[PDB]
Amino acid sequence: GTTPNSEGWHDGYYYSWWSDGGGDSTYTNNSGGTYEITWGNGGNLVGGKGWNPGLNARAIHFTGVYQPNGTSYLSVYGWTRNPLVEYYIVENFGSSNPSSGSTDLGTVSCDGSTYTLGQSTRYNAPSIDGTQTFNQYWSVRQDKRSSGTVQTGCHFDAWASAGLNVTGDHYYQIVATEGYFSSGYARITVADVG
Numbered sequence: 001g002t003t004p005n006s007e008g009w010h011d012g013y014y015y016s017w018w019s020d021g022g023g024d025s026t027y028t029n030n031s032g033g034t035y036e037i038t039w040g041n042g043g044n045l046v047g048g049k050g051w052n053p054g055l056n057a058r059a060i061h062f063t064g065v066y067q068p069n070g071t072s073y074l075s076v077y078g079w080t081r082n083p084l085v086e087y088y089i090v091e092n093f094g095s096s097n098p099s100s101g102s103t104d105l106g107t108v109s110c111d112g113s114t115y116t117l118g119q120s121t122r123y124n125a126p127s128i129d130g131t132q133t134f135n136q137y138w139s140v141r142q143d144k145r146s147s148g149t150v151q152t153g154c155h156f157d158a159w160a161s162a163g164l165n166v167t168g169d170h171y172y173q174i175v176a177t178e179g180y181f182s183s184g185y186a187r188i189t190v191a192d193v194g
Contacts, residue, residue, distance in 0.1 A: 001024070002021060002023070002024055002026075003019075003027045003028075004023070010029040010049070011032050012032075013032075014050055014172050015047070015050070015174065018046055018047065018115055019039075019044070019045035019047075019054065020043045023040050023185060024040040024042070025037065025045055028050070030187075031102075033049055033172075033189045033190040033191050034049070035048060035187075036120075036186070036188075037179075038182045038185050039185075041181060044178075044180050045178065046178040046179075048079070048177055048188065048190075049174055049175065049190050050172060050173050050190060051172065051174070052172040052173070053169075053171065053172070053173070054078045054170040054171065054172060055170065056152065056153055056170075057151070057152055058152050058173065058192060059192065060076060060175060060193070061150075061190065061192045062074075062150070062189065062191075063146070063188070064146065064147070064186065065146070065185070066093035067186065068095075069094075069183055070181070070183065070184070071094050071179075072091075072093065072094040072179045072180065072184050073092070073093040073098050073151065073178050074091050074093070074175070074176075075175075076091070076176075077088050077176040078170065078171065079127075079128050081128075081129070082137070082167055083135065083168050084133075085137060086122075086132060086134060087137040087159075088140075089139045089141075089155050090139065090140045090141060091145055091150065092139050092145060092146055093127040093144065094184075098138075099116070099118045099120075099140050101120060102118035102136065103119050104118055105118055105159075105162045105164075106162065108139070110139075110154035110158070111148065113143040114143075115139045115140060116138075116142065117139055117158060117159065118138035118139075119137055119162075119164060120136045121136070122134055122136070124132055127172055136192075139155045139159070149193060159170060163167035172173070174190075175188060175190045
């Protein structure tokens with residue numbers, strides 16, 4: 001009995017939950033910075049807790065249980081407007097690297113690991129502002145983990161040094177769990193430690 005799409009405030013944190021309706025799955029907001037997602041096969045879904053607005057430099061801690069059975073990722077995720085950008089700082093992932101179809105921009109060292117940087121463009125696709133064209137910025141951790149601190153400003157400075165624009169107006173900034181035609185479970189707690 002799939003939880004309906006929702007976004008807004010819970011216990012002082014912003015959250016977003018969306019699915020394409022094809023998979024059975026339950027999204028629950030728990031106390032404080034915690035959320036839980038249980039999902040089956042059949043569709044595309046993404047949900048998590050965080051802040052609105054995001055900042056170019058926030059120190060975000062996360063911890064918990066992350067158990068994908070197939071294609072999935074755990075990342076700091078969010079959007080800017082002017083320009084329209086969807087960005088991903090990927091800390092862990094299942095069977096496939098979500099940035100494999102993007103242009104390689106080199107590496108950066110952040111929070112104890114090398115991260116591979118990338119950029120892609122999506123044309124006429126679903127976004128926070130309806131069907132639009134937007135750029136996607138990627139930073140993917142080489143040493144996968146399920147707990148730790150992410151200094152987002154390490155990634156936004158790396159993207160800026162690579163030529164990308166990072167002066168957009170921020171929308172939300174969450175620690176999101178995504179599943180893509182595969183089943184899984186996750187229970188994650190986030191916090192701002194800056």
